């Protein structure tokens, strides 16, 4: 969550690929922060 919110906010795209290669898990993909 906080790994994905950090990696997407600063363009670390390979970190986002290793966080979203786990398919059929879409609760964290649209989860919002504070």
């Amino acid at each position: 969550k906080s790994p994905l919110h950090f990696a997407a906010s600063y363009g670390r795209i390979n970190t986002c690929q290793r966080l979203l290669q786990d398919i059929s898990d879409t609760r964290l993909l649209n989860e919002g922060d504070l």
Partner: protein, 39 residues
């Protein structure tokens, strides 16, 4: 007024350098090793 127009050009390239500088720092965070600080 010639002093102001010299200062405007000396500021116009300064903000051009800072924007060029800003994308470099954005690239540093984009490509950086983070293992100890991965929350």
């Amino acid at each position: 007024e010639m002093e102001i127009l010299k200062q405007k050009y000396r500021l116009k390239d300064l903000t051009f350098l800072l924007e060029k500088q800003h994308e470099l720092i954005k690239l540093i965070i984009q490509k950086m090793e983070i293992i100890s600080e991965t929350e």
